[PDB]
């Protein structure tokens, strides 16, 4: 009846995929995998510094630990390969440890049993890579290995399309004012990555970082592919982000009204248009994969020459995970 | 010794005290804000950002002492009513915020001294000064200055170089800025009714409105009405990054051309990094800009580009030092 969901991962992605799949019909999740104990789990799912108290009732229990009455087995074990999928009759995984952001990788969970994986970041290898309600259509039920994108990608990809499809995009650079992460360092420290400014402390500054988001859109809207580029900044706030993008379009005499209409026009649960003067903490736990903030779009126009500048809000956590959530019931209801 | 007085004893007008200690031929002798001298001391020998004061201070009567030298401390909110002829005041660094425009100014002049610098973008008929980028324009007959903005005093090298070496065409501006005094600490009514400025400034993204790009073409003429552009309020006390997104005249260009062209116009107040470097790095550096080298982005799509660079600057201290750099050239040209 119920499709049997697995999180691999019971991090900030982990704990809001799972708060999101209590309020979705016919999709269960009934496993839990990461490197901690069920004690820590039940703890960091029912309390969330940015988020808030989880809204239900988390006991914990033998083995794993009970949500609203009912049991969610948890486990402990690094290698995929080495989970109980086909014993427990997994139909799809939440890739959301950031280790298997790989096809060949993540095959460790269809090894393991799973029928699908699905991946919490954008992915190398031959998949298709789904913004919802951008291009979750490219799904058709064969794949086995899905990516989720980045979260940039998703607040990025419906504006993106938007100018395209309406204005012709010649070409543009995107930067996103980006909230910290967890693969940031508290203090000054050596990397694991090698890093250097990641290496640096998350909440005294600002952060210059590379992001695939830009330069990967193809993927997402193939019409478009290698149009797009450009970096993020990250600064001191732990959830809600923000991305800019600065364009060169193929209509002439382009006006500031037009272009937030056109976003009016596109607007779905994934793609929101906003008009109110609103700031970061504001988008907060907020279900819009990308949040149109009308009131930054700005043209430069030096006689026939025009720069298009757009920002879109997105709560980089819950934003992405309500995409992702959706991304997943889809494909899932795709299987009969 | 040219005699300053400073109206507006704050982020600014301290660390504009601090600069001038060491700047000879130029002494602070008086000093004007809102508050008693037993405060006024206390925040010129504790900073949070920039650190403790060097020098020694005392409280005295009508005043305080650095190092020897007295300071006449005052509180007048009415600039009009400042001995300023009493004392012989040559200049007064202007840095309330209140005195942003030139008819507004001409009160330090009525009150008796010879001329004002405007810590900030000012309205009226006067020139806007980024030091080494367009002091020049200053030949003495003047009578009250503007001492641009922090992300004009970023901007302004760096688009220099820009529109004389490749031809600016257009371009767009974010600048990821520190959070200032004129912000809210908590979700509060704003003096002014920004309804962005009105939130708690250390837990938000908070975009605002600046005329740093906009209103270039009062330091370089050559490319008025070619820039616009905002800001990005966040949670860090002080440092910022001037993002410039340019359309430019010159083909086939490679990020490595621009970067050259960064490093040869180099000076005291145009710097250069090609190491990684984060916002606190900048905190209390004498650059008035910093071109961060790793930053340089070129886009190509065919024969179309789109260029991207990045400046850094410590808002309060990059400021400062080109204010009071520009105060010392304003000094001796008298
Ligand atoms: N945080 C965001 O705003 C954001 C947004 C979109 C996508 N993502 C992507 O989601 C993934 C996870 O992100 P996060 O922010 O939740 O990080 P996180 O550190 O909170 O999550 C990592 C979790 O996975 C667990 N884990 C690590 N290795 C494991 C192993 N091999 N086996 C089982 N569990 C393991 C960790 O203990 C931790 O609980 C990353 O790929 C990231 O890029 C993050
Ligand atoms: N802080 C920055 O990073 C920055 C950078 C460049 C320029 N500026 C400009 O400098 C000016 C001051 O900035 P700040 O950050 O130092 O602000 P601030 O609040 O620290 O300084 C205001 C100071 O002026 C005093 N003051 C206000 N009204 C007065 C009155 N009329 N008479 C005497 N004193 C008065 C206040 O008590 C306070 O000490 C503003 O124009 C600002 O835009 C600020």
């Known amino acids: 009846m119920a499709v049997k969901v697995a999180i691999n991962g019971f991090g900030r992605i982990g704990r809001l995929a799972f708060r999101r799949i209590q309020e979705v019909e016919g999709l269960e999740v009934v496993a839990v995998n990461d490197l901690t104990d069920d004690d820590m789990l039940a703890h960091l799912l029912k309390y969330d510094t940015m988020q808030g108290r989880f809204t239900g009732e988390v006991e914990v229990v033998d083995g794993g630990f009970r949500v609203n009455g009912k049991e969610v087995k948890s486990f402990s074990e690094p290698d995929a390969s080495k989970l109980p999928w086909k014993d427990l009759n997994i139909d799809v995984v939440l890739e959301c440890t950031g280790f298997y952001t790989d096809k060949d990788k993540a095959q460790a969970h269809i090894e393991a049993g799973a029928k699908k994986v699905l991946i919490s970041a954008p992915a190398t290898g031959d998949l298709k890579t789904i913004v919802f309600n951008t291009n979750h259509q490219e799904l058709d039920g064969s794949e086995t290995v899905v990516s989720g994108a980045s979260c940039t990608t998703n607040s990025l990809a419906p504006v993106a399309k938007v100018l395209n499809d309406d204005f012709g995009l010649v070409e543009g650079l995107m930067t996103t004012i980006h909230a910290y992460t ?10 694991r990555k090698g890093d250097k400014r990641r290496a640096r402390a998350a ?6 970082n590379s992001t695939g988001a830009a330069k990967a859109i193809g993927k997402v809207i193939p019409e478009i592919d290698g149009k797009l580029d450009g970096g993020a900044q990250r600064v001191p706030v732990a959830t809600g982000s923000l991305t800019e993008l600065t364009v060169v379009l193929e209509k002439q005499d382009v006006t500031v009204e037009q272009v937030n209409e056109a976003m009016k026009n596109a607007s779905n649960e994934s793609f929101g248009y906003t008009e109110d003067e609103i700031v970061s903490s504001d988008v907060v736990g907020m279900t819009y994969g990308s949040l149109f903030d009308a009131t930054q779009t700005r043209v430069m126009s030096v006689g026939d020459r025009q720069l298009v500048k757009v920002a879109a809000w997105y709560d980089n956590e819950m934003s992405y995970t309500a995409q992702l959530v959706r991304t997943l019931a889809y494909l899932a209801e795709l299987s009969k």
């Open 203 to 208: 909440a005294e500054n600002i952060i210059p």
């Open 182 to 191: 967890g693969d940031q360092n508290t203090q000054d420290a050596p990397h």
